[PDB]
């Protein structure tokens, strides 16, 4: 059913699953179909490496990778049966871990073009920083926004290994001529950048 | 030496009705099962069926029970899964995969043989309406050190749409993000660029959205405004 | 009919009897995932023991006519041997294509 979502590692690195019948583990890697690596808890299928191992540490089963490898960065799926059903678990990325990196933070107004069909869309962007955990926050003449804006992170990039995140504030046509300042602020730990634009310079 | 080669699917109206086919190779057909596991863009796996020999061993999971059917022919070495009924949640990549003839009986606490040889995946997307995206300029934010540019993709339905820039002659630091939902049951995204600022002025930035549900293709010129 | 037991986790060098029980012809096969269904042992009930090269003398397969039983002792275990096992030339005597019936098998794991 649940494993540890999300994982950074180095090459070099142990790393170990969990998964909450004995369970089967499938990697896969983006636009490419599963591949079947332990079966049977702890039996390494053909063709697998060495490095991976299975367990069951308890009452849970387990995946290892005892020196993780460049071609081993993937999604890992436990799957289990009950009765005549079989299901996959939630899945576990194993990325990258790198150097801390602030975002560059770029404010974008709405164009003229969107304008004049009575949108107005403020995007802020979060480029190249690392890691993905932020938290972002609209402000409108000072005051802070929720409800109104919708968030998006790409995959890791596959030359720096960092994140970029956009975030877009919808408001009416109207809502926006109101109104002055704008600003998003972008927190990472100790860290809080605001950008922000005077509407119509 | 052992092939599962799917085929079948792609676009369908909701209300609609479909047929995909894994036709296998190179092993004895009816000492195994055959499973359909599904993926829906940029979200888990979901198994879905399974058939073996004998008709009767069938099963489905609660998600499609009604809706779909399996079925199989041992002349050649094929198996089916009829789908109807086809909602929204359908959209996804399909894969056929192979497990053991008598999975269910053998599973048990220390033994789980899991689906060794897959397909390569088919498509299925059910448009239940379309629209074509608005495209709007994310202009230059600076005039210098780095500027960013981008496109917002707007209120389209449904997935997906493709972004290229320069027709692909610029791909470096290039970020298209993953549509959004948006509460209007529209999707968006943004597509953004980072360049030398000291290129605004001697190099053009187009964005070439691509939208094949709708068979549109808007091409945007972003320029500093 | 056929049905086997027997079947379960072991340890690498541990050992393990797999049974069968029948309702004219013996033989033993297993099937790991990835690979076809491969013979292991045979017995010529009219006589006679023949085995693969995969059961460097580790494996024995006895009888009992008067409990209508064939079984398998299999000695020394090792990973490569995790399957599933099921239930004429004497050239061609260790091959799935010669066999009328089969059990639905038990499955064995070998891990440490």
């Known amino acids: 059913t649940q494993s540890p979502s999300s994982l950074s590692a180095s090459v070099g690195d142990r790393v170990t699953i969990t998964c909450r019948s004995a369970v089967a583990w499938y990697q896969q890697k983006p636009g490419k179909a599963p591949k079947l690596l332990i079966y049977?808890?702890?039996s390494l299928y053909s063709g697998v490496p060495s490095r991976f191992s299975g367990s069951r540490s308890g009452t849970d089963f387990t995946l290892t990778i005892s020196s993780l490898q460049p071609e081993d960065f993937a999604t890992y799926y436990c799957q289990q049966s009950s009765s005549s059903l079989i299901t996959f678990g939630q899945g576990t990325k194993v990325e990258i871990k790198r150097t801390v990196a602030a975002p560059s933070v770029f404010i974008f107004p709405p164009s003229d073009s969107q304008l004049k069909s009575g949108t107005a869309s403020v995007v802020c962007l979060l480029n190249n920083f690392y890691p993905r955990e932020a938290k972002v926050q609209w402000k409108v003449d000072n005051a802070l926004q929720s409800g109104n804006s919708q968030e998006s992170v790409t995959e890791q990039d596959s030359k720096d290994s960092t994140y970029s995140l956009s975030s877009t504030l919808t408001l009416s046509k109207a809502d926006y001529e109101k109104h002055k300042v704008y600003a998003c602020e972008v927190t990472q730990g100790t860290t809080s950048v605001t950008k922000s634009f005077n509407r119509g310079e | 030496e052992v092939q599962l080669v799917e085929s079948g699917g792609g676009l369908v109206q909701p209300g609609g009705s479909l047929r995909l086919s894994c036709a296998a190779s190179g092993f004895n057909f009816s000492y195994y099962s055959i499973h359909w596991v599904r993926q829906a863009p940029g979200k888990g796996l979901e198994w879905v069926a399974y058939?073996?020999?004998?008709?009767?061993?069938?099963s489905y999971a609660d998600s499609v029970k009604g809706r779909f059917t399996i079925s199989a022919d041992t002349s050649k070495n094929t198996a089916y899964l009829q789908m109807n009924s086809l909602r929204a949640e359908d959209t996804a990549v399909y894969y056929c995969a192979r497990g053991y003839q008598y999975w269910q009986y053998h599973a048990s606490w220390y033994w789980n043989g899991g689906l060794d040889y897959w397909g390569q995946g088919t498509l299925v997307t059910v448009f239940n309406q379309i629209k074509g995206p608005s495209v709007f300029p994310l202009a230059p934010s600076s005039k210098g050190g780095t500027a960013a540019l981008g496109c917002l993709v707007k209120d389209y339905f449904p997935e997906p749409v493709t972004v290229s820039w320069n027709s692909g002659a610029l791909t470096s630091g290039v970020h298209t993000f993953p549509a959004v939902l948006q509460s209007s049951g529209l999707y968006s995204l943004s597509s953004v660029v980072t360049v030398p600022s000291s290129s605004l002025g001697t190099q053009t930035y187009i964005c070439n959205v691509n939208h094949k549900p709708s068979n549109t293709k808007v091409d945007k010129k972003v320029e500093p405004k | 009919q056929l049905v086997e037991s027997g079947g379960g986790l072991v340890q690498p060098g541990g050992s393990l009897r797999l049974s069968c029980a029948a309702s004219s012809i013996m033989t033993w096969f297993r099937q790991a995932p990835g690979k076809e269904r491969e013979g292991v042992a045979a017995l010529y009930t009219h006589t006679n023991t023949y085995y693969a090269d995969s059961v460097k003398g580790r494996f024995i397969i006895s009888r009992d006519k008067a409990k209508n039983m064939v079984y398998l002792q299999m000695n020394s275990l090792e990973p490569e041997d995790t399957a599933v096992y099921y239930c004429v030339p004497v050239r061609f005597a260790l091959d799935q294509s010669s066999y009328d019936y089969w059990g639905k098998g038990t499955p064995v794991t070998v891990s440490s």
């Open positions: 058939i073996s020999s004998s008709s009767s061993y069938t």
């Open positions: 049977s808890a702890s």
